[PDB]
Amino acid sequence: AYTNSFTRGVYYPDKVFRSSVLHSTQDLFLPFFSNVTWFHAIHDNPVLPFNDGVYFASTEKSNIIRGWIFGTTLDSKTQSLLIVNNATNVVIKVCEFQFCNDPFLGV
Amino acid sequence: TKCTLKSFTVEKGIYQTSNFRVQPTESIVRFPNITNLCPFGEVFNATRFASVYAWNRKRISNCVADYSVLYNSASFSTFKCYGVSPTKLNDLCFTNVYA
Amino acid sequence: LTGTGVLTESNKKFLPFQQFGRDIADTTDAVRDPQTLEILDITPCSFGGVSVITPGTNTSNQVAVLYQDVNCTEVRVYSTGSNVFQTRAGCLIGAEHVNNSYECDIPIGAGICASYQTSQSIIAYTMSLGAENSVAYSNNSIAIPTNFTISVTTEILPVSMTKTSVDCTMYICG
Amino acid sequence: YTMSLGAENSVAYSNNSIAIPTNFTISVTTEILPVSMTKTSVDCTMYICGDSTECSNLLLQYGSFCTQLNRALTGIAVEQDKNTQEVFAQVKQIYKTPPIKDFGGFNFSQILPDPSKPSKRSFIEDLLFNKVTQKFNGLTVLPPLLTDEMIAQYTSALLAGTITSGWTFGAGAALQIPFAMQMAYRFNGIGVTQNVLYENQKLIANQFNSAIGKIQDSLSSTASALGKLQDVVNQNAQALNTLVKQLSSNFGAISSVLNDILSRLDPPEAEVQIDRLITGRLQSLQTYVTQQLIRAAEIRASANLAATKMSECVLGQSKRVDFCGKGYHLMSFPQSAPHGVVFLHVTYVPAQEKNFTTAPAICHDGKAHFPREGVFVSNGTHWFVTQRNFYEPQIITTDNTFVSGNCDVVIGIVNNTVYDP
Amino acid sequence: SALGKLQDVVNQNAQALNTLVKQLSSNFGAISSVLNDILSRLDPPEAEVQIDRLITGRLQSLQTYVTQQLIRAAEIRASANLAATKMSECVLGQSKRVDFCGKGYHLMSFPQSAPHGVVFLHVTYVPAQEKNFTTAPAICHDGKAHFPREGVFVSNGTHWFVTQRNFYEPQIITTDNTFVSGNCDVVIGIVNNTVYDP
Ligand SMILES: *[C@@H]1O[C@H](CO)[C@@H](O[C@@H]2O[C@H](CO)[C@@H](O)[C@H](O)[C@H]2NC(C)=O)[C@H](O)[C@H]1NC(C)=O
Ligand SMILES: *[C@@H]1O[C@H](CO)[C@@H](O[C@@H]2O[C@H](CO)[C@@H](O)[C@H](O)[C@H]2NC(C)=O)[C@H](O)[C@H]1NC(C)=O
Ligand SMILES: *[C@@H]1O[C@H](CO)[C@@H](O[C@@H]2O[C@H](CO)[C@@H](O)[C@H](O)[C@H]2NC(C)=O)[C@H](O)[C@H]1NC(C)=O
Ligand SMILES: *[C@@H]1O[C@H](CO)[C@@H](O[C@@H]2O[C@H](CO)[C@@H](O)[C@H](O)[C@H]2NC(C)=O)[C@H](O)[C@H]1NC(C)=O
Ligand SMILES: *[C@@H]1O[C@H](CO)[C@@H](O[C@@H]2O[C@H](CO)[C@@H](O)[C@H](O)[C@H]2NC(C)=O)[C@H](O)[C@H]1NC(C)=O
Ligand SMILES: *[C@@H]1O[C@H](CO)[C@@H](O[C@@H]2O[C@H](CO)[C@@H](O)[C@H](O)[C@H]2NC(C)=O)[C@H](O)[C@H]1NC(C)=O
Ligand SMILES: *[C@@H]1O[C@H](CO)[C@@H](O[C@@H]2O[C@H](CO)[C@@H](O)[C@H](O)[C@H]2NC(C)=O)[C@H](O)[C@H]1NC(C)=O
Ligand SMILES: *[C@@H]1O[C@H](CO)[C@@H](O)[C@H](O)[C@H]1NC(C)=O
Ligand SMILES: *[C@@H]1O[C@H](CO)[C@@H](O)[C@H](O)[C@H]1NC(C)=O
Ligand SMILES: *[C@@H]1O[C@H](CO)[C@@H](O)[C@H](O)[C@H]1NC(C)=O
Ligand SMILES: *[C@@H]1O[C@H](CO)[C@@H](O)[C@H](O)[C@H]1NC(C)=O
Ligand SMILES: *[C@@H]1O[C@H](CO)[C@@H](O)[C@H](O)[C@H]1NC(C)=O
Ligand SMILES: *[C@@H]1O[C@H](CO)[C@@H](O)[C@H](O)[C@H]1NC(C)=O
Ligand SMILES: *[C@@H]1O[C@H](CO)[C@@H](O)[C@H](O)[C@H]1NC(C)=O
Ligand SMILES: *[C@@H]1O[C@H](CO)[C@@H](O)[C@H](O)[C@H]1NC(C)=O
Ligand SMILES: *[C@@H]1O[C@H](CO)[C@@H](O)[C@H](O)[C@H]1NC(C)=O
Ligand SMILES: *[C@@H]1O[C@H](CO)[C@@H](O)[C@H](O)[C@H]1NC(C)=O
């Protein structure tokens, strides 16, 4: 499934304050009105390409989505960034983690 | 006006000759209120370094360093900087640092 | 980051990660004080053009100073007293303000002109546009000249300019 | 699509048919001319080397490059006030219309300054001012010598002179004349006998008032009215905005910010990078000044045209075709506008025509009779002589025609009789 | 100061040349403004660089001079075209264009040469003295409205006369001064008088 990204995906290109100005800058942005793949978590957690950068979006009411894994093989053979947000603690690690065939966290 | 027109005679009229600018009375020097030292001692004079393929990265934070005793040191066979002069270094309060 | 300017209070709500602001010209607009987390605007040390209104040195060495597009507030020798006249062109110091209008002599701007008059000094005034002369208009009255004058006027027009020629090779690499 | 070049309209030409208008319309058109442009001034030293002693010392190696650009911009600013003076300050006095505005039925309340309002400005001028729309960075704007109020006073004096004295106030002293008689002269000046004005004085006055009302409506509704002055303002704003933006360019330097170079590079390299920025910014200033000089020459030419129209259109009556609007020029009225002038051209335009049979001359006793003024027309039974620009048939008499030559010479001469009073 | 319009032009050209000459003293980043002092001191690998800087600066100065001269020449060309128009329609003819050939009603013009320019002596007719006369757009005789062929009707308080617009010269109102058009019930402000029939 795909949907329309419309005008989402705009971020501050740097940490310089600007006001009342139209500034033209070239960077890695999400193209306007592009197609974004819609994934479901009901009743499906595949591995997606990262390419040159990924735009991510989520809608929450009970904090179902709790982390991200980035890498190439995700099998302890290379370094893979692991980000987990558990209640109030954001944890970032770059260890050579040995991941399960289908990584998940239980309640 | 005489200097602006490069003449000791000024004809009748109105001339734009200079610009009024208030001059500063004192200088204002502002830096973060931190009185700590850098770990450069244990980074340069470390007991063992890492292999080039496994190059080690050491972030630094909240410290002050004097690269003049390093530029003046014959121990360092190579000291070359790009985008910033190695001499004028204790002026610009550095922002990010990764050794 | 170095510069010259007046540091003033601001109402610009900088984000926690933003340290410097910039103007249209990409110059520094404001800074966050590294010791006290407040945002201070940097306004270049108030400035403006300085023009000298003077009669020729064959008449007098007294001058008036026009500070362009400034208030008579922020303003070695020339002080900020005696005759100070605020005009829409700026703050004029040294010229006496005269209520009587005259034909414009040394133009200042925004309707204000200056001249050297009376013991003599530089005066500033609102320039006259001409004498006021109403027309005795009515629906049944016409004025017809009974006499005339033959006048001769002089109109001078440039036709040519000096036929200069530049030896570019000898000039650059003589 | 392929653009049309206008409607196709053949002319019913023949060797013995003339179309003479039987009715007319008084039209008012709006011609907008730039007179002046923003009196910009550039502090070349602060622009290139703002609050930098080292940069200024390096700039000193370029000699007079700075002061000659200040000189060029000063010359431009001065000639802008010369342009304003040439266009508006063409009257030696400052006349003022009397309270009685009974100008033969012509309503001028929408062009003469409203007494109630503080500044002497007409309703139309108020409409015009509502249509035309770096601070700490060297670039300054000088005020004009003549304020908008003073320009309004000059236009009021010129309008009052034109209304109360016709063209006499321009040549010499203002000689009062009833406005209807002024219009009688204006009609005689275009080949229309003055009796046409007096017979149609109420109709002409109503047509003029309606034309003024339409001008007010057009200027109060259409937003693309002052497209010639707004374009000039936009060009000057764009030039200044481009000049300001040029400060952000590197021109080959490591950074456009002079203070960031000074705090980072040693003199042997900082001087080189500053030399690159100075060269780039000086080239930018020279480009700006050259563009301003060319635009100023265009503005001066436009101002000279505006002054020519003021003198030969408002102060007099123009015989130059389409110089003062389409049609036969009667009069013009000046109005001020931001950095420009608006002329309201009142012209005579033929409205309705009939096909009449004509002849170059009429034979009576063998002599060839030619009209002193007008042409011969026939409605099919009788020949008449009438003025060229308005159908008004008159009996052919010895006071309308003259004799020259004989009937055997003129090609197309017709036989008739000439009445002898 | 009467000839300032031409003297300023001369001064501008002299000033431009003086500025150009002064431009030879600028370094433009070179070690010296004197080309011979660079040539006698530096080897080609550095002398060529210093000379390149001086050439760039002097060529930019020449281009600035030439551009200013082209703009000034265009202004002079427009002025010359105006002068030729004045010669043709002012000296060679008689101008009906208001204030084109001086203030007043143009009669004639006389050319005079001047250094790098032309001076026109404009001889014009200017009304000098005026009187307040009562006027009327038309005169009734037998119910017809009589209008002047040229000039206007005036009254000195007892008699109506017709006179040329630009000079008071009252004449008896006759059928050779007026013409008949329409009737008395149309013209607003028409007055009663008599028209003499020779
Ligand atoms: C018309 O004006 C001219 C001059 O503008 C008058 O000529 C002068 O008249 C006065 C007395 O009337 C003499 O004293 C002068 O010597 C005359 N000057 C010249 C050059 O002749 C002329 O008199 C005026 N005519 C009328 C009828 O007013
Ligand atoms: C001349 O025109 C003006 C405006 O077109 C007239 O003023 C208007 O008069 C009417 C009543 O006659 C008022 O209802 C309007 O409000 C007036 N306009 C304004 C802007 O106040 C004026 O009366 C006309 N004069 C003559 C003699 O016709
Ligand atoms: C000539 O044209 C004018 C208008 O261009 C005519 O005036 C109009 O006449 C109609 C009917 O007579 C009126 O309803 C309008 O109000 C008039 N207009 C104005 C502005 O008053 C005029 O009648 C025409 N005359 C001839 C002989 O054709
Ligand atoms: C051409 O014009 C003449 C002049 O008006 C017309 O002649 C008059 O026409 C009217 C029409 O009602 C008569 O009442 C007059 O008695 C006529 N007078 C004379 C002296 O003929 C003539 O009719 C017009 N012809 C056309 C075809 O329009
Ligand atoms: C205009 O009138 C004249 C004379 O009234 C005409 O001339 C006549 O032409 C015929 C034709 O050859 C001759 O037989 C007559 O002898 C001529 N008359 C005279 C007095 O010489 C002339 O032809 C007429 N033209 C038109 C166009 O009608
Ligand atoms: C208006 O002008 C007429 C024409 O000259 C004057 O009439 C003459 O006035 C003179 C005055 O000396 C008498 O001698 C003549 O006899 C008058 N002639 C006629 C035919 O009346 C008339 O006086 C002038 N009016 C005024 C008020 O000066
Ligand atoms: C000009 O003269 C005519 C007649 O000579 C005047 O017309 C008279 O006007 C009165 C007033 O309405 C009528 O009672 C008469 O019957 C009219 N006369 C005729 C012959 O019809 C006219 O009023 C005069 N105008 C002026 C300004 O004096
Ligand atoms: C998104 O996908 C649909 C069909 O899969 C396609 O028609 C549409 O053009 C795509 N959007 C864009 C921006 O290409
Ligand atoms: C989240 O996980 C980290 C890693 O062990 C742990 O230290 C922290 O207490 C956890 N927080 C919560 C709220 O579970
Ligand atoms: C390393 O040790 C030497 C002396 O053995 C000393 O001179 C040098 O400054 C030290 N380097 C640092 C970074 O402290
Ligand atoms: C001053 O002006 C007078 C005339 O106005 C002149 O004669 C004199 O030579 C001038 N002197 C100087 C020094 O300009
Ligand atoms: C100058 O400042 C005073 C108050 O500080 C103010 O009342 C006045 O209007 C100002 N004038 C101008 C020209 O800014
Ligand atoms: C000018 O006139 C005003 C009255 O509007 C008065 O207050 C002021 O003092 C006068 N100034 C001089 C110098 O006469
Ligand atoms: C004159 O006749 C032609 C014949 O077709 C006609 O087209 C034209 O409209 C007529 N002129 C007028 C003013 O109607
Ligand atoms: C005018 O044209 C018609 C066309 O048939 C012709 O018969 C007639 O002779 C012409 N008249 C003149 C004077 O050319
Ligand atoms: C005409 O009358 C007016 C009325 O005030 C007067 O001012 C004017 O001077 C008179 N003209 C002449 C020439 O006397
Ligand atoms: C001229 O104006 C006067 C002013 O009172 C008036 O009485 C008279 O009727 C007017 N006449 C005309 C023809 O307008």
Side-chain angles (χ1 to χ4, degrees), chain A, chain B, chain C residues 1-75 77-174, chain D, chain E:
Chain A
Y2 295 83
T3 190
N4 190 333
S5 66
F6 296 104
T7 58
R8 304 296 186 178
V10 176
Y11 61 90
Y12 290 80
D14 60 20
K15 299 184 171 70
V16 174
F17 178 83
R18 296 182 180 82
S19 63
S20 300
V21 61
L22 309 182
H23 179 69
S24 174
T25 182
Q26 181 178 24
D27 207 329
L28 302 176
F29 292 99
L30 184 67
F32 276 9
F33 297 100
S34 66
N35 281 346
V36 299
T37 305
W38 180 12
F39 300 88
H40 297 81
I42 62 173
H43 295 292
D44 194 11
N45 59 337
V47 178
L48 293 322
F50 191 80
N51 298 336
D52 295 322
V54 173
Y55 171 80
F56 185 97
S58 62
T59 57
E60 291 285 358
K61 63 185 180 180
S62 59
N63 196 29
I64 297 301
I65 299 164
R66 295 185 185 177
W68 298 265
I69 305 168
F70 302 86
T72 61
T73 59
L74 286 72
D75 59 359
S76 194
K77 296 179 188 176
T78 190
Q79 299 85 233
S80 177
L81 174 66
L82 173 64
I83 301 170
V84 179
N85 186 28
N86 61 345
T88 59
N89 290 89
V90 176
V91 179
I92 301 172
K93 296 181 179 179
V94 296
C95 305
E96 296 183 357
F97 284 107
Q98 178 67 69
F99 290 113
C100 300
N101 290 341
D102 185 0
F104 66 91
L105 179 67
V107 176
Chain B
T1 301
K2 288 178 178 180
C3 290
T4 297
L5 300 175
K6 303 291 187 296
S7 183
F8 284 60
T9 300
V10 177
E11 296 84 355
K12 181 162 169 278
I14 180 171
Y15 301 89
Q16 182 172 289
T17 64
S18 193
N19 293 86
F20 174 72
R21 294 187 296 276
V22 174
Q23 302 299 302
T25 300
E26 62 181 303
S27 65
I28 306 298
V29 179
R30 298 257 96 185
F31 296 90
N33 192 31
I34 190 66
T35 89
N36 295 339
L37 295 174
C38 300
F40 274 171
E42 61 188 44
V43 178
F44 284 80
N45 284 335
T47 165
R48 52 193 265 206
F49 276 51
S51 294
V52 59
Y53 85 101
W55 49 278
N56 196 37
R57 162 161 293 182
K58 169 49 174 337
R59 181 177 181 170
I60 297 169
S61 278
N62 284 254
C63 81
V64 306
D66 182 12
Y67 325 120
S68 186
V69 296
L70 309 174
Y71 186 90
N72 291 19
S73 179
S75 304
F76 296 159
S77 169
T78 299
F79 200 108
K80 309 211 288 186
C81 298
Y82 304 85
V84 49
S85 296
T87 78
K88 294 180 180 179
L89 270 183
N90 222 281
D91 182 355
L92 61 81
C93 172
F94 288 79
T95 317
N96 192 31
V97 174
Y98 282 101
Chain C
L1 173 64
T2 65
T4 300
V6 179
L7 306 175
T8 69
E9 293 181 352
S10 74
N11 60 338
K12 295 180 182 297
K13 185 179 182 180
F14 280 28
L15 300 176
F17 62 96
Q18 297 178 316
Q19 181 60 35
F20 302 96
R22 292 182 189 269
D23 210 326
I24 300 300
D26 211 38
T27 63
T28 304
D29 183 55
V31 296
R32 184 167 62 181
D33 180 304
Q35 294 182 357
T36 174
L37 303 180
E38 65 177 1
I39 307 306
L40 308 174
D41 282 341
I42 301 171
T43 299
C45 299
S46 176
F47 71 102
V50 179
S51 294
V52 179
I53 299 161
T54 182
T57 57
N58 190 341
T59 299
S60 178
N61 292 325
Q62 185 176 35
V63 303
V65 180
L66 176 69
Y67 296 87
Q68 296 173 11
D69 200 25
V70 302
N71 203 339
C72 297
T73 55
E74 296 302 320
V75 177
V77 175
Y78 255 78
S79 33
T80 187
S82 71
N83 289 337
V84 180
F85 181 27
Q86 181 76 64
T87 72
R88 291 187 175 191
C91 186
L92 178 64
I93 300 174
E96 183 178 1
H97 185 205
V98 176
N99 265 344
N100 296 323
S101 65
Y102 304 88
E103 291 185 2
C104 187
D105 188 1
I106 301 169
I108 295 173
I112 304 300
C113 298
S115 68
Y116 188 70
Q117 294 186 14
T118 58
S119 64
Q120 294 179 302
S121 68
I122 297 169
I123 62 170
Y125 51 87
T126 300
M127 64 178 182
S128 177
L129 303 182
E132 185 177 356
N133 184 12
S134 64
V135 178
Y137 178 86
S138 67
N139 54 340
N140 63 350
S141 180
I142 187 166
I144 297 171
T146 63
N147 202 349
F148 63 87
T149 181
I150 305 302
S151 64
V152 179
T153 66
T154 299
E155 185 171 17
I156 301 166
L157 301 171
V159 173
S160 63
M161 59 181 276
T162 299
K163 292 168 65 176
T164 64
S165 176
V166 180
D167 177 344
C168 54
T169 301
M170 185 175 175
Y171 175 83
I172 298 169
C173 296
Chain D
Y1 53 88
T2 300
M3 64 178 182
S4 177
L5 303 182
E8 185 177 356
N9 183 13
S10 63
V11 178
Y13 178 86
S14 67
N15 54 340
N16 63 349
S17 181
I18 187 166
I20 297 171
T22 64
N23 202 349
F24 63 88
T25 181
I26 305 302
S27 64
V28 179
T29 66
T30 299
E31 186 169 16
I32 302 165
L33 301 171
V35 173
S36 62
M37 59 181 276
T38 299
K39 291 168 65 176
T40 64
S41 176
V42 179
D43 178 344
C44 53
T45 300
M46 184 175 175
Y47 176 82
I48 297 169
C49 297
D51 298 331
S52 174
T53 299
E54 296 80 7
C55 186
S56 180
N57 288 342
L58 291 170
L59 183 59
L60 292 174
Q61 295 180 343
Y62 289 85
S64 68
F65 267 133
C66 199
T67 58
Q68 73 180 357
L69 296 173
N70 290 343
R71 183 182 296 110
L73 291 172
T74 298
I76 293 169
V78 171
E79 76 180 49
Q80 298 314 301
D81 289 308
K82 182 177 176 180
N83 290 341
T84 298
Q85 238 94 341
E86 287 185 346
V87 173
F88 293 99
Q90 296 188 356
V91 63
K92 64 174 186 176
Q93 296 299 320
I94 302 299
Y95 318 78
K96 63 185 248 160
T97 58
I100 59 171
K101 293 179 179 179
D102 59 316
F103 299 96
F106 292 81
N107 191 336
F108 299 114
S109 68
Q110 305 303 117
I111 59 170
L112 305 152
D114 202 337
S116 150
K117 248 71 180 282
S119 149
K120 293 179 179 179
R121 274 245 293 286
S122 49
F123 185 116
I124 289 170
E125 284 170 301
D126 282 340
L127 296 175
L128 297 172
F129 276 85
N130 292 331
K131 293 297 185 187
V132 177
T133 60
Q134 64 180 20
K135 184 189 183 69
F136 296 99
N137 201 3
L139 299 175
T140 67
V141 175
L142 302 172
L145 179 59
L146 282 76
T147 63
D148 289 346
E149 182 177 3
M150 289 179 166
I151 301 300
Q153 289 180 33
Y154 271 130
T155 58
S156 179
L158 291 166
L159 178 56
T162 299
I163 292 168
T164 65
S165 62
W167 45 72
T168 67
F169 83 98
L175 309 185
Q176 69 270 23
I177 185 169
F179 193 76
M181 291 179 69
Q182 178 177 312
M183 289 301 289
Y185 301 173
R186 304 268 177 184
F187 270 65
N188 284 340
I190 62 166
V192 180
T193 306
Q194 66 190 75
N195 70 294
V196 173
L197 167 67
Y198 293 118
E199 292 174 16
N200 294 286
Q201 184 173 337
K202 290 180 181 179
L203 175 63
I204 292 165
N206 286 336
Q207 290 178 347
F208 175 76
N209 294 340
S210 294
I212 295 298
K214 290 178 182 178
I215 296 300
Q216 291 179 90
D217 282 5
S218 168
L219 290 168
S220 195
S221 178
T222 299
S224 81
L226 314 188
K228 288 182 177 181
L229 269 45
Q230 185 66 10
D231 188 63
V232 172
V233 172
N234 287 343
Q235 288 183 38
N236 290 325
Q238 184 64 52
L240 288 171
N241 288 338
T242 300
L243 182 61
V244 173
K245 287 179 180 180
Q246 286 299 98
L247 291 169
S248 71
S249 293
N250 290 333
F251 304 114
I254 62 172
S255 175
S256 71
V257 179
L258 184 59
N259 289 349
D260 290 341
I261 293 169
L262 290 167
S263 72
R264 291 189 291 163
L265 301 177
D266 289 338
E269 298 179 359
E271 289 177 359
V272 173
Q273 299 302 312
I274 294 167
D275 283 347
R276 291 178 189 179
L277 291 179
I278 290 170
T279 298
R281 290 174 175 180
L282 181 58
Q283 184 180 16
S284 180
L285 287 170
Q286 289 172 345
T287 299
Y288 171 78
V289 172
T290 298
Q291 296 298 140
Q292 291 293 99
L293 289 167
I294 294 168
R295 188 176 297 109
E298 295 302 320
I299 295 297
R300 185 173 65 250
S302 182
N304 287 342
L305 176 60
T308 298
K309 287 187 191 300
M310 190 72 81
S311 293
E312 301 178 42
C313 204
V314 176
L315 272 62
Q317 181 175 15
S318 174
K319 300 293 180 65
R320 297 172 64 187
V321 174
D322 300 350
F323 183 67
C324 289
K326 187 180 83 76
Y328 298 98
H329 180 248
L330 296 173
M331 59 184 174
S332 297
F333 305 118
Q335 300 283 268
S336 67
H339 296 295
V341 66
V342 177
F343 292 94
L344 304 179
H345 300 301
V346 183
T347 62
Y348 174 99
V349 179
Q352 301 182 324
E353 315 96 32
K354 291 182 181 180
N355 287 347
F356 297 101
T357 298
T358 187
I362 286 173
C363 288
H364 183 65
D365 294 321
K367 299 296 183 181
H369 293 71
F370 302 88
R372 286 188 171 85
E373 299 182 359
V375 295
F376 292 129
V377 299
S378 169
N379 69 356
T381 63
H382 292 76
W383 285 92
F384 304 97
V385 58
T386 190
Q387 64 186 312
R388 289 188 286 271
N389 294 298
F390 188 79
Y391 183 64
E392 185 180 66
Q394 299 181 320
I395 300 301
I396 300 167
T397 74
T398 60
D399 293 333
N400 291 327
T401 68
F402 65 90
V403 296
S404 295
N406 62 61
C407 296
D408 293 330
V409 179
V410 177
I411 298 168
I413 194 162
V414 302
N415 276 316
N416 207 52
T417 63
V418 179
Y419 173 76
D420 185 347
Chain E
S1 65
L3 274 287
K5 288 182 177 181
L6 268 45
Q7 185 66 10
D8 181 65
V9 172
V10 173
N11 288 343
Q12 288 182 38
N13 290 326
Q15 185 64 52
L17 289 172
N18 287 338
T19 300
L20 182 61
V21 173
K22 288 178 180 180
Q23 286 299 97
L24 290 170
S25 71
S26 293
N27 290 333
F28 305 114
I31 62 172
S32 175
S33 70
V34 179
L35 183 59
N36 289 349
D37 290 340
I38 293 168
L39 290 167
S40 72
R41 291 187 291 162
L42 301 177
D43 288 338
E46 297 179 0
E48 289 177 359
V49 173
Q50 300 302 312
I51 294 167
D52 282 347
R53 290 179 188 180
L54 291 179
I55 291 170
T56 298
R58 290 174 175 180
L59 182 58
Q60 184 179 16
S61 180
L62 287 170
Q63 289 172 345
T64 299
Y65 170 80
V66 172
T67 298
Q68 297 297 145
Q69 294 294 99
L70 288 167
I71 294 168
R72 187 176 297 109
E75 180 177 358
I76 295 297
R77 162 133 208 103
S79 182
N81 288 342
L82 177 60
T85 299
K86 288 187 191 301
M87 190 70 81
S88 293
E89 301 178 43
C90 203
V91 176
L92 272 62
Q94 181 175 16
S95 174
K96 299 292 180 65
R97 297 172 65 186
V98 173
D99 301 350
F100 184 66
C101 289
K103 187 181 82 76
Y105 298 97
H106 180 249
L107 295 174
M108 58 185 174
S109 297
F110 305 118
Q112 301 283 268
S113 67
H116 295 296
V118 65
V119 178
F120 294 95
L121 304 179
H122 301 301
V123 182
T124 62
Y125 173 98
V126 179
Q129 301 181 324
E130 315 95 32
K131 292 182 182 180
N132 287 347
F133 297 101
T134 298
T135 187
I139 286 173
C140 289
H141 183 64
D142 294 321
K144 299 296 183 181
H146 294 62
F147 303 88
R149 286 188 171 86
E150 298 183 359
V152 295
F153 293 130
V154 299
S155 169
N156 69 356
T158 63
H159 292 76
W160 286 91
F161 304 98
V162 58
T163 190
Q164 64 187 312
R165 289 188 286 270
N166 294 297
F167 188 79
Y168 182 63
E169 184 180 66
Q171 299 180 320
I172 300 301
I173 300 167
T174 75
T175 60
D176 293 333
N177 291 327
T178 68
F179 65 92
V180 296
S181 295
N183 63 61
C184 294
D185 293 330
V186 179
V187 176
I188 298 168
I190 194 163
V191 302
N192 277 316
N193 206 233
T194 63
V195 179
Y196 174 76
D197 185 348

